[PDB]
Design a protein around this ligand. Structure first.
Ligand SMILES: CCCCCCCCCCCCCCCC(=O)OC[C@H](COP(=O)(O)OC[C@H](O)CO)OC(=O)CCCCCCC[C@H]1C[C@H]1CCCCCC
Ligand SMILES: CCCCCCCCCCCCCCCC(=O)OC[C@H](COP(=O)(O)OC[C@H](O)CO)OC(=O)CCCCCCC[C@H]1C[C@H]1CCCCCC
Ligand SMILES: CCCCCCCCCCCCCCCC(=O)OC[C@H](COP(=O)(O)OC[C@H](O)CO)OC(=O)CCCCCCC[C@H]1C[C@H]1CCCCCC
Ligand SMILES: CCCCCCCCCCCCCCCC(=O)OC[C@H](COP(=O)(O)OC[C@H](O)CO)OC(=O)CCCCCCC[C@H]1C[C@H]1CCCCCC
Ligand SMILES: [Ca+2]
Ligand SMILES: [Ca+2]
Ligand SMILES: [Ca+2]
Lengths: 225, 225, 225, 225
């Protein structure tokens, strides 16, 4: 095919061969802008055909029109007082998603490592908590057995044991108070920001929303893989 | 003023009466296109007027021009080639938002439904929790009963009971501690996807932003109710 | 003055008298667009003067230029091969802030009432909490006096009082547990949404930011009153 | 390639060598203006080229054209009126952001300073709290000492001390309760306005959004470090 349409990072690029010519356009504009440019090129009439080649309205939106050009996979131009009836290619779905899909992929790559780092750190802290917790539980159960034996295996009795209990509880309060003070007195080595991870995820969400929107616009059931 | 400017879902429409004819235009589409249409329609010059009748430029955009027209709710047209002067209607804020506000309303309805379903399942779980809680409270009341009966209905006495009290209290702390350790070591009824709830919510908020932007572009303080 | 510039809700409106003519422009565009329109009007040269009437560069931005037009309070146009050297008015600071400042004012009006409603409701809840709290404090102090008298004014003794204390503490636990359950079992009359208030405040913040930005751009020390 | 395209803080500049002359343009300013400049500069036709050498339209915008030019980092010019062909430089991403990225850097510096000051005052308040806390802990340790001495250094006994313990515990609950009731009933050193901190933070984030938008408009994955 002699002419073509290349996509660009925001807005389509149309290469037409009548030393060819190139145009930029924004999607939400109409075809009349394009007619005006093509007319100011040549030294008047012009028409656009899609589907089976019926003429569409010049006051129509482009982004609502390339989709039909794609379901037929072509685009047709007609000029009054001249030869030629020009076929032109069209971007597919993948073509529209390119330069966008790739950026999502890069962001996912950058997310994976940081997720592994979070995994490591969380597991470390969890093992610490679990072990010290089980130690404290063993301590309490030891106290339980001690009190039971001292109660029901001696002549000492509760009349000697009760103050021991009061004093031990107060000692526990003191120790807890000191631990709290000391604590008032994390991701360092594989260091990162939770907000960096959050912002990358925030970007990825909206990128997926845009992609699924375009997918629904063509109805071609997009797969993330 | 028989003729007028009718709206459609995106692109305005002009019903011009001289039968009266309906012409489609895009908001970014300059007035000179309108001149070329009307010229080709009829068997040449032309002019527009607004406010106190001033002629505007022909290369001015419409979607901004209609706003100055809406300041007065009337718009004047003049033709070189026939006598007289023509008057034309203008839209209002409610006009432009109509066919754009109904969608917000419907989405709000969907949200209300799904929220009701969510609330129902929440009430179910809450009732289960209340059941377990009352089951627990019964045990404490029975404990109080047992303590009073054994104390002031027997000869054993507080000297025999107090250690049991300290013992059971420590046992209870241990038990809750074990619940913690074990713990740390759906809507098949009327299902709704959180993704769907979220998507509807975000879409509605985007609609709101668009509408308030248009409102500020007219300064007509839209209420949601 | 025969010509003028009216402000519009986003973008300036220029009324020039050569049956005058009207133009819309966006601020960030350059003066060359304006030259092109004025040239396509007439049947070539054109120049713009500001300050003491020195010619500025046509590739300059407008929004950076009306400010100088305002510090001199005029604007000058010159056309080649024609008579006339046109003075034109300019919008002041207040002129740029109009249609924006008023909207802030309306939002403030709507905020005031809702603030009063919050005041009323908070005071009601605070009085409730304070009174019931003082009642509970009186109860505890009564218990204190009772225990002191029963200890050191009888032959009964702690050997009779201790179980009363255990039982009373357990009764308090039961009552607290029941209160918690019943609570699990607010702004109604002057009802509003905290999020509505929040959104209005959010709007007002950004509006003030825009206004102060423009103020710094002219350096005219804006007062909110 | 002696000639080139130099940047300035907003508006690009073109140094064309034939001494070589420097011409100012605005990014939205169409190429036909550039044609008129170059035509009037010299003693007529003209043409542009990019990629594999294709002639673009003359009514195309620059600020999009430079992007396709930056795909290759070279841009070609042709003149009807002299022989030969001309080549011209192109900017890069770092070029366009230079004089726009330095501001972000400076704002980050200000933020770091003010954060340091904030942190210092926070440490002061924290040290005061630590002082009061250790003062409190001393009293509990003295309480434990008193209890042990009175108990196991005298003949009074737990039968005389236990009620005092319950009494003091209830008194302490009452005291904390009163602290609550009374409670419910700055940076003169190195001052910083929270408004200033907030404004710098928001401005920096806006700069970031602008830069990432341009990055996606080139697909050149800007890092902040
Ligand atoms: C974890 C904490 C475990 C604590 C275990 C305590 C076991 C006590 C066993 C015992 O019967 O001790 C008897 C002695 C000695 O108790 P006598 O022999 O004086 O009691 C005679 C009768 O009267 O009591 C004392 O001398 C005072 C102990 C104070 C401990 C403070 C800990 C902090
Ligand atoms: C729910 C818990 C209900 C239990 C309430 C306490 C009732 C106990 C009545 C009883 O007969 O026990 C008396 C004996 C001891 O009481 P003696 O009868 O043996 O004392 C005789 C002289 O001394 O108690 C013990 O030996 C230790 C019991 C500890 C239970 C631990 C539960 C956890
Ligand atoms: C707020 C709560 C305030 C509770 C105040 C309690 C004052 C008790 C005064 C007293 O000495 O009572 C003596 C009697 C009777 O106590 P006797 O007379 O049997 O004690 C004789 C010796 O032995 O004790 C009982 O009959 C059992 C009382 C149980 C109260 C449970 C409340 C819940
Ligand atoms: C900090 C608090 C320090 C107080 C620690 C307790 C030391 C008390 C020693 C003493 O001599 O008191 C004995 C008498 C009673 O102890 P008698 O000496 O009168 O008992 C003689 C026979 O009975 O106690 C009372 O009468 C009531 C004291 C309550 C204090 C309340 C503090 C709040
Ligand atoms: Ca005893
Ligand atoms: Ca006791
Ligand atoms: Ca006790």
């Amino acid at each position: 095919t002699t002419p073509s349409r290349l996509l660009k990072l925001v807005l389509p690029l149309s290469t037409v061969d009548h030393a060819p010519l190139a145009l930029l356009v924004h999607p939400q504009q109409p075809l009349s802008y394009l007619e005006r440019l093509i007319q100011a090129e040549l030294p008047e009439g012009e028409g656009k055909d899609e589907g089976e080649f019926v003429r569409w309205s010049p006051s129509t939106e482009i982004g609502d029109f390339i989709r039909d050009a794609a379901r037929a996979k072509e685009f047709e131009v007609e000029i009054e007082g001249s030869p030629g009836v020009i076929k032109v290619a069209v971007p597919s779905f993948n073509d529209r998603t390119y330069y966008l899909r790739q950026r999502l992929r890069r962001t996912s790559r950058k997310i994976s490592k940081l997720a592994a780092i979070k995994e490591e750190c969380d597991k470390a802290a969890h093992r610490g908590a679990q072990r010290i917790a089980l130690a404290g539980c063993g301590g309490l159960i030891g106290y339980w057995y001690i009190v039971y034996r001292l109660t029901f295996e001696t002549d000492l009795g509760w009349d000697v044991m009760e103050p021991v209990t009061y004093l031990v509880g107060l000692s526990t309060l003191i120790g807890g108070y000191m631990w709290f003070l000391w604590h008032n007195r994390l991701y360092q080595a594989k260091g990162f920001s939770l907000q960096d991870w959050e912002g990358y995820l925030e970007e990825a969400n909206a990128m997926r929303r845009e992609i699924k929107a375009v997918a629904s616009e063509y109805d071609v059931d997009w797969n993330e893989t």
